[PDB]
Amino acid sequence: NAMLSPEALTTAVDAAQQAIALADTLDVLARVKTEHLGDRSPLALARQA
RNA sequence: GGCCAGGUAGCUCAGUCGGUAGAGCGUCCGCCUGAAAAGCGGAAGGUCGGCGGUUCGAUCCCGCCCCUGGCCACCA
Ligand SMILES: [Mg+2]
């Protein structure tokens, strides 16, 4: 429900994009991908819900 | 070229007919050891063979194609 509002999605997209722009090496980016796009990220749980 | 069964993690396989997909071993970390392994605890890792389509969304539905194993067939 609340996890599916455009406010809570944009909240997750904004946090995802923030970590992505801040990652400055390939190895930090991989951990960013895991946390903001992997099976347990906010955006992944919203597709599971 | 024919028939059957398949292609899912680094290896060996289970599984799923629309929104989470997994095990054994392999990898990494913490405690531990002088350093290890085991044990205990915790992670990473898959374009589910490919390209189109359908769909708000496809490992899963439709189309085309590719490869693997077995049994045939052919032959210097
Ligand atoms: Mg394999």
JSON list of C-alpha atoms (C1' of nucleotides) in Angstrom, two decimals, chain B:
[
{"chain": "B", "resi": 1, "resn": "G", "atom": "C1'", "xyz": [19.33, -35.35, -41.63]},
{"chain": "B", "resi": 2, "resn": "G", "atom": "C1'", "xyz": [15.25, -38.26, -38.02]},
{"chain": "B", "resi": 3, "resn": "C", "atom": "C1'", "xyz": [13.38, -39.29, -32.84]},
{"chain": "B", "resi": 4, "resn": "C", "atom": "C1'", "xyz": [13.40, -38.41, -27.31]},
{"chain": "B", "resi": 5, "resn": "A", "atom": "C1'", "xyz": [14.74, -35.58, -23.21]},
{"chain": "B", "resi": 6, "resn": "G", "atom": "C1'", "xyz": [16.70, -31.02, -21.97]},
{"chain": "B", "resi": 7, "resn": "G", "atom": "C1'", "xyz": [19.39, -25.58, -21.49]},
{"chain": "B", "resi": 8, "resn": "U", "atom": "C1'", "xyz": [18.16, -22.35, -14.47]},
{"chain": "B", "resi": 9, "resn": "A", "atom": "C1'", "xyz": [24.54, -19.70, -9.96]},
{"chain": "B", "resi": 10, "resn": "G", "atom": "C1'", "xyz": [31.56, -20.79, -10.76]},
{"chain": "B", "resi": 11, "resn": "C", "atom": "C1'", "xyz": [30.44, -26.77, -10.97]},
{"chain": "B", "resi": 12, "resn": "U", "atom": "C1'", "xyz": [26.18, -30.74, -10.46]},
{"chain": "B", "resi": 13, "resn": "C", "atom": "C1'", "xyz": [21.05, -30.39, -10.45]},
{"chain": "B", "resi": 14, "resn": "A", "atom": "C1'", "xyz": [15.74, -29.51, -8.14]},
{"chain": "B", "resi": 15, "resn": "G", "atom": "C1'", "xyz": [11.79, -26.28, -9.51]},
{"chain": "B", "resi": 16, "resn": "U", "atom": "C1'", "xyz": [8.15, -22.69, -11.35]},
{"chain": "B", "resi": 17, "resn": "C", "atom": "C1'", "xyz": [2.13, -22.50, -16.95]},
{"chain": "B", "resi": 18, "resn": "G", "atom": "C1'", "xyz": [2.68, -13.48, -15.17]},
{"chain": "B", "resi": 19, "resn": "G", "atom": "C1'", "xyz": [4.56, -9.51, -10.03]},
{"chain": "B", "resi": 20, "resn": "U", "atom": "C1'", "xyz": [10.03, -13.90, -4.20]},
{"chain": "B", "resi": 21, "resn": "A", "atom": "C1'", "xyz": [13.90, -18.97, -7.91]},
{"chain": "B", "resi": 22, "resn": "G", "atom": "C1'", "xyz": [16.43, -22.54, -4.64]},
{"chain": "B", "resi": 23, "resn": "A", "atom": "C1'", "xyz": [19.91, -26.82, -2.84]},
{"chain": "B", "resi": 24, "resn": "G", "atom": "C1'", "xyz": [24.85, -29.32, -2.51]},
{"chain": "B", "resi": 25, "resn": "C", "atom": "C1'", "xyz": [29.64, -27.88, -3.32]},
{"chain": "B", "resi": 26, "resn": "G", "atom": "C1'", "xyz": [32.66, -23.11, -5.13]},
{"chain": "B", "resi": 27, "resn": "U", "atom": "C1'", "xyz": [33.30, -17.29, -3.51]},
{"chain": "B", "resi": 28, "resn": "C", "atom": "C1'", "xyz": [33.49, -13.40, 0.43]},
{"chain": "B", "resi": 29, "resn": "C", "atom": "C1'", "xyz": [33.04, -11.62, 5.85]},
{"chain": "B", "resi": 30, "resn": "G", "atom": "C1'", "xyz": [32.77, -11.93, 11.55]},
{"chain": "B", "resi": 31, "resn": "C", "atom": "C1'", "xyz": [33.98, -15.03, 16.00]},
{"chain": "B", "resi": 32, "resn": "C", "atom": "C1'", "xyz": [37.97, -18.56, 16.13]},
{"chain": "B", "resi": 33, "resn": "U", "atom": "C1'", "xyz": [43.81, -19.94, 14.98]},
{"chain": "B", "resi": 34, "resn": "G", "atom": "C1'", "xyz": [50.50, -17.79, 15.10]},
{"chain": "B", "resi": 35, "resn": "A", "atom": "C1'", "xyz": [48.28, -18.60, 10.29]},
{"chain": "B", "resi": 36, "resn": "A", "atom": "C1'", "xyz": [44.37, -22.24, 8.71]},
{"chain": "B", "resi": 37, "resn": "A", "atom": "C1'", "xyz": [40.14, -25.78, 8.15]},
{"chain": "B", "resi": 38, "resn": "A", "atom": "C1'", "xyz": [36.11, -27.57, 10.65]},
{"chain": "B", "resi": 39, "resn": "G", "atom": "C1'", "xyz": [32.08, -25.56, 13.77]},
{"chain": "B", "resi": 40, "resn": "C", "atom": "C1'", "xyz": [28.88, -21.36, 14.77]},
{"chain": "B", "resi": 41, "resn": "G", "atom": "C1'", "xyz": [26.91, -16.85, 12.49]},
{"chain": "B", "resi": 42, "resn": "G", "atom": "C1'", "xyz": [26.31, -13.64, 8.08]},
{"chain": "B", "resi": 43, "resn": "A", "atom": "C1'", "xyz": [26.88, -11.96, 2.89]},
{"chain": "B", "resi": 44, "resn": "A", "atom": "C1'", "xyz": [27.68, -11.66, -2.51]},
{"chain": "B", "resi": 45, "resn": "G", "atom": "C1'", "xyz": [26.59, -14.06, -7.03]},
{"chain": "B", "resi": 46, "resn": "G", "atom": "C1'", "xyz": [21.50, -15.73, -12.22]},
{"chain": "B", "resi": 47, "resn": "U", "atom": "C1'", "xyz": [20.31, -10.84, -18.33]},
{"chain": "B", "resi": 48, "resn": "C", "atom": "C1'", "xyz": [16.21, -18.94, -15.62]},
{"chain": "B", "resi": 49, "resn": "G", "atom": "C1'", "xyz": [19.95, -20.35, -23.88]},
{"chain": "B", "resi": 50, "resn": "G", "atom": "C1'", "xyz": [19.00, -15.85, -27.56]},
{"chain": "B", "resi": 51, "resn": "C", "atom": "C1'", "xyz": [16.02, -12.18, -30.46]},
{"chain": "B", "resi": 52, "resn": "G", "atom": "C1'", "xyz": [11.24, -10.30, -31.49]},
{"chain": "B", "resi": 53, "resn": "G", "atom": "C1'", "xyz": [5.96, -10.09, -29.78]},
{"chain": "B", "resi": 54, "resn": "U", "atom": "C1'", "xyz": [1.72, -10.02, -26.09]},
{"chain": "B", "resi": 55, "resn": "U", "atom": "C1'", "xyz": [1.22, -7.45, -21.44]},
{"chain": "B", "resi": 56, "resn": "C", "atom": "C1'", "xyz": [1.36, -2.02, -16.84]},
{"chain": "B", "resi": 57, "resn": "G", "atom": "C1'", "xyz": [4.88, -6.11, -16.05]},
{"chain": "B", "resi": 58, "resn": "A", "atom": "C1'", "xyz": [7.50, -12.56, -18.98]},
{"chain": "B", "resi": 59, "resn": "U", "atom": "C1'", "xyz": [12.17, -17.85, -16.62]},
{"chain": "B", "resi": 60, "resn": "C", "atom": "C1'", "xyz": [6.67, -19.09, -17.15]},
{"chain": "B", "resi": 61, "resn": "C", "atom": "C1'", "xyz": [2.13, -17.22, -22.81]},
{"chain": "B", "resi": 62, "resn": "C", "atom": "C1'", "xyz": [2.98, -16.72, -28.73]},
{"chain": "B", "resi": 63, "resn": "G", "atom": "C1'", "xyz": [6.66, -16.75, -32.85]},
{"chain": "B", "resi": 64, "resn": "C", "atom": "C1'", "xyz": [11.56, -17.40, -34.97]},
{"chain": "B", "resi": 65, "resn": "C", "atom": "C1'", "xyz": [16.20, -19.33, -33.81]},
{"chain": "B", "resi": 66, "resn": "C", "atom": "C1'", "xyz": [20.61, -21.46, -31.22]},
{"chain": "B", "resi": 67, "resn": "C", "atom": "C1'", "xyz": [23.00, -24.99, -28.36]},
{"chain": "B", "resi": 68, "resn": "U", "atom": "C1'", "xyz": [23.52, -29.66, -24.98]},
{"chain": "B", "resi": 69, "resn": "G", "atom": "C1'", "xyz": [22.89, -35.15, -23.81]},
{"chain": "B", "resi": 70, "resn": "G", "atom": "C1'", "xyz": [21.08, -39.85, -25.49]},
{"chain": "B", "resi": 71, "resn": "C", "atom": "C1'", "xyz": [19.31, -43.22, -29.26]},
{"chain": "B", "resi": 72, "resn": "C", "atom": "C1'", "xyz": [19.29, -43.68, -34.54]},
{"chain": "B", "resi": 73, "resn": "A", "atom": "C1'", "xyz": [20.96, -42.49, -39.71]},
{"chain": "B", "resi": 74, "resn": "C", "atom": "C1'", "xyz": [25.18, -41.37, -43.00]},
{"chain": "B", "resi": 75, "resn": "C", "atom": "C1'", "xyz": [30.58, -41.95, -44.31]},
{"chain": "B", "resi": 76, "resn": "A", "atom": "C1'", "xyz": [37.17, -41.03, -46.58]}
]
